[PDB]
C-alpha cells in the first residue's frame, strides 16, 4: 500500500476532528454544541454543512477561557429554551470536565431550576486525526455520556456512520421490511426540512436522549463503519456486554446481503421475499448495463474510508477496474483491515494510498494514469473538470450537484442508484466526447 511520500499537503481530502464532532452532534435532537475555540472554526464548519445540505444548523461558539465556557453555556441556555444536550468541543488552541461538574452543581440548579440540561465534553485536537476520527470519538462520547442499563430491549443499535439522509432512509426501509426495531445513530432524515406555508420548520437531528440511553439495553450493535462507530460499539460491548458486529458497509449487492445476514443473526428475524424482489430489481437494472458498459472501466475512488472501501468492492463486483483508492487520513488501522487485505490480494492493479490528498490523484493522472470515472465528493471536482474525467458525487461534501443527500448509496436501492448513476455519467461523457455515442441505441 502506498503511503504519501510528500510531507506537505496539496488539496486536503478531509477537515479537522472538531468538524466531525460537530457533524455528529447536529444529528441529535435538542442538541446545540458549543465549540471552545475561535468563532471562525464554527463559522467554517457551519458553512461546510450548509454547502453539503443547503440547510442551516445551530452550533454555538465560545469565542476564545474556562470561564468563557461558563458564560457561553449560560448564554446558550438563556437564548434556547429547548436545548437539552450541550456538548463542549475543544479545538487547536484549547479542564472542561471539572468545570462542567461545577456547572451542573451551581449554575444549572440555581439559574435553570427544573430544566433538564446535560453537559458533556468532546476533546478533539485538530492535529492528531481527521474529521473521521472526530466523528468516531464524538459518537463514542455521546454513547458513553448517555448509555444507561435498564430493562432489556428487543431493539438493536444501528450506528450508521457518517451517512446521508437518503442512506438512512434506505437502511430504515430495510430494517422495517426485516421487521427489526433499532436505535439508529443518527436519525438525519430531518436534515431535509420542508418549506412550509405558515409555520417555519428548521433542519435538526432526530436522535433523542432516550435512544442514546437505551443503547445500553439493546440485543446487539451493528456498526456499519469500522472507522465511524466502532468505538461506541466497543464501549457498549466492554461496559454493558452488548454484542457488537462491525461492518460490512452495505455498498452494493453482496455487502447488503452480508448486512441483512448480520441483522438476521442478531435478531433471529428471517430475510423475507420482498427484499429478494427488491434485490432482484436492482440486479436486473445492473444486468442491463454491466458487461455492456461497466466492465473494464478504470475508476478512481476517494470518500470516507468505509464508503470508499465499499465502493471499491462494489466496482470490483461490477467488473470495473479500480485503479486508485485514496484514504485521506493517517489512520493506522487501514493496513490491518481485512477488506484492504482482500483488495491487495485479489485486485493487484489497485493502488491504495493512505494519508492521501487530492494531489495524489492529480499527479498520478499527470504522470499518465488513464481513468474513465471518479467516485468522490465535491472538493475534488476540479480534477474532474480540468482533466476531463467524469465524476459521480459520493460522500461528504457534495455541494456542486443538487440533492445528492436524498439518494442512497447503501442497500439495494443504493446499489441501483450507484450503478445507474455511474452508467449515466459515462453516457454523458461519451456524448460530450463523441466516443462511440451512437452505441446508446439498442443496448
Amino acid at each position: 500500500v502506498t503511503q504519501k511520500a510528500r510531507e506537505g499537503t496539496i488539496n486536503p481530502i478531509f477537515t479537522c476532528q472538531p468538524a466531525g464532532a460537530q457533524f455528529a452532534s447536529i444529528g441529535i435532537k435538542d442538541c446545540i454544541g458549543i465549540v471552545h475555540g475561535g468563532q471562525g472554526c464554527v463559522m467554517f464548519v457551519r458553512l461546510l454543512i450548509s454547502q453539503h445540505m443547503k440547510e442551516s444548523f445551530e452550533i454555538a461558539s465560545s469565542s476564545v477561557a474556562l470561564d468563557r465556557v461558563e458564560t457561553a453555556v449560560e448564554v446558550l441556555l438563556t437564548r434556547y429554551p429547548d436545548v437539552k444536550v450541550v456538548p463542549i468541543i475543544t479545538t487547536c488552541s484549547t479542564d472542561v470536565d471539572g468545570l462542567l461538574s461545577k456547572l451542573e452543581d451551581e449554575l444549572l440548579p440555581t439559574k435553570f431550576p427544573g430544566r433538564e440540561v446535560h453537559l458533556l465534553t468532546v476533546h478533539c485536537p485538530s492535529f492528531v486525526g481527521s474529521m473521521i476520527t472526530g466523528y468516531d470519538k464524538a459518537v463514542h462520547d455521546f454513547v458513553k455520556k448517555f448509555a444507561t442499563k435498564d430493562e432489556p430491549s428487543d431493539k438493536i443499535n444501528l450506528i450508521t456512520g457518517w451517512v446521508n439522509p437518503g442512506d438512512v432512509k434506505e437502511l430504515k426501509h430495510l430494517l422495517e421490511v426485516m421487521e427489526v426495531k433499532a436505535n439508529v445513530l443518527f436519525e438525519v432524515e430531518s436534515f431535509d426540512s420542508p418549506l412550509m406555508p405558515d409555520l417555519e420548520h428548521h433542519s435538526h437531528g432526530s436522535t433523542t436522549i432516550e435512544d442514546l440511553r437505551d443503547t445500553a439495553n439493546a440485543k446487539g450493535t451493528i456498526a456499519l463503519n469500522r472507522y465511524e462507530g466502532m468505538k461506541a460499539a466497543d464501549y457498549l460491548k466492554k461496559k454493558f456486554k452488548v454484542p457488537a458486529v462491525i461492518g460490512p458497509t452495505p455498498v452494493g449487492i453482496r455487502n447488503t446481503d452480508a448486512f441483512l445476514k448480520a441483522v438476521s443473526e442478531m435478531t433471529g428475524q428471517p430475510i423475507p421475499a420482498q427484499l429478494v424482489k427488491e434485490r432482484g430489481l436492482a440486479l436486473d437494472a445492473i444486468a442491463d448495463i454491466g458487461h455492456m458498459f461497466l466492465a473494464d472501466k478504470r475508476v478512481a475512488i476517494y470518500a470516507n474510508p468505509d464508503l470508499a472501501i465499499g465502493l471499491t468492492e462494489f466496482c470490483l463486483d461490477l467488473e470495473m477496474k479500480p485503479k486508485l483508492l485514496l484514504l485521506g487520513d493517517d489512520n493506522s488501522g487501514y493496513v490491518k483491515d481485512p477488506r484492504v487485505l482482500a483488495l491487495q490480494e485479489n485486485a493487484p492493479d489497485l493502488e491504495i494510498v493512505t494519508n492521501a490528498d487530492f494531489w495524489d490523484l492529480e499527479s498520478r493522472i499527470q504522470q499518465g494514469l488513464e481513468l474513465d470515472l471518479i467516485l468522490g465528493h465535491s472538493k475534488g471536482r476540479f480534477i474532474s473538470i480540468d482533466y476531463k474525467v467524469p465524476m459521480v458525487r459520493v460522500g461528504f461534501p457534495t455541494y456542486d450537484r443538487a440533492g445528492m443527500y436524498r439518494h442512497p448509496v447503501l442497500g439495494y436501492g443504493g446499489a441501483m442508484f450507484l450503478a445507474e448513476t455511474m452508467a449515466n455519467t459515462l453516457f454523458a461523457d461519451m456524448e460530450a466526447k463523441k466516443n462511440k455515442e451512437w452505441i446508446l441505441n439498442v443496448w
Binding site: R254, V276, I286, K436, V442
Partner: protein, 399 residues
Amino acid sequence: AKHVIGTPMKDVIHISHGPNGCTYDTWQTKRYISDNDNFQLKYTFATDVKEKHVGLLKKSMHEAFDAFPNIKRMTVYQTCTTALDVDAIAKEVMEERGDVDVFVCHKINIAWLNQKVGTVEPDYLGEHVINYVGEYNIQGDQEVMIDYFNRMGIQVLSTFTGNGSYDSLRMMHRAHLNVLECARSAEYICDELRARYGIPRLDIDGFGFEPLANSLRKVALFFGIEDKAEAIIAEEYAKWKPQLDWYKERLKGKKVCLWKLWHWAHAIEEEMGLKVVKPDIIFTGKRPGEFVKKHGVPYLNAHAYHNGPYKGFEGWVRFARDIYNAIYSPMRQLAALDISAPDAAITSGFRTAKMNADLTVSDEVKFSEVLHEYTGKYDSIAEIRARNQAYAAEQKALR
C-alpha cells in the same frame, strides 16, 4: 433493402415515399457507422403520406436537398401505401437542381446494377483493385477489413454498402476482383458483375484468426502478393494470439446457444473452446436477449455486437473478452443466490470475473507469463480509422 442494404450508404438522402411511422420504426436501431459523421444514422426522410393523398414527392425531395446542401445523392423508396410516377419526378428534380443524382429503388441489387453501375468512372485505378461486397460496417467492421487490405497494398474501389459512397458504388464495374462477405444479401450483385464485366469472385471470411488469415492469403494469392499477407498474419498473430488464448483457456467447454451462425460457429469452437449447442451464453438479438436475461443467461447481440467490432484479429479478442465478461460476471452468481434461504451462501467483500475463471484453469495456465488479458481501448476504430484516412491521404499525394 431500405433497412439493411441501402441505408449504410453514407452520403445519400434516403427518403421513403410513405408515412412517418415506418421511417420512425427503423431509425436509430442499427449500428452501421461511417466516417461521414454518421449522416445515415442521424437523419431519416419521409414523404409523409396522409389519407388525402391516398407533387408532394417533388416538394419533399426538394426540401431535403435544401436542408442538406452538402448531399447530392438521393434514393427514393416506395412503401406499402404508395403502391396504390416516381421515375419521372426524380428526372425532373435532377433537371431542376442540375447537380444531384437520384436512384429509384435481392431487389435493390437488380435496381442498383441496372441503373447506377457503369455510369461514373474511377479517377485512379491501382495495381490491385477489389470491390468489398456484402459488408455493412457494423461498429466498424468495414474499416477493420480496409485496414487489412491497405496494409496489403490493395485499393478498395467500393464497399457495398457499409461506409460506402454513392459514386464508388456506381464505379463498381472496374474492379479486378469481388470479395464476398455476405452472400445471402449480395450474391446477385457479384453474379451479374461477373456476367457483364467478367470480374472474378472470391468468397472470404472476416471472423476468427484462421478464417481471416486464410481469406487474406487467398486475396494475396489472387494478386501474387502472398508475402504481404504473411507479414500481416504474423504481426497480428504475435500481437493478439496471447490475449486470445488467455480467454480461450478460461472459456474451454462453455456452452453457447445460437438464436453469424455459420460465419461464427466453427471458429468459435476452434479458437475459443466454446461448445455450440442450460447454456452459459446466448447469441441473439436485443429483445430475445432481454427475454433470456430473466432466466439468468447473459446474451451478446448477434446483430449489432456488444463491444464491437468483432471482425479482425483484435475484434476476435474483443469478442472473446465480451463472452468471458458475460459468462464470469460476479453479478451472475449473486443473482442466482436466494438470500431468503435458511442456509444461504451469503458472503461479503467482492469477487472478480478473473477469480471465477481461474478456478477452471490449471496452475500452468494460471501463472503464464505469455497469456494476458485484452489490452485495447474502448473505441478500437478511432486508431484504425485514422490509419485509413492517412493511407488515403498518402495515396492522394503519390497520384
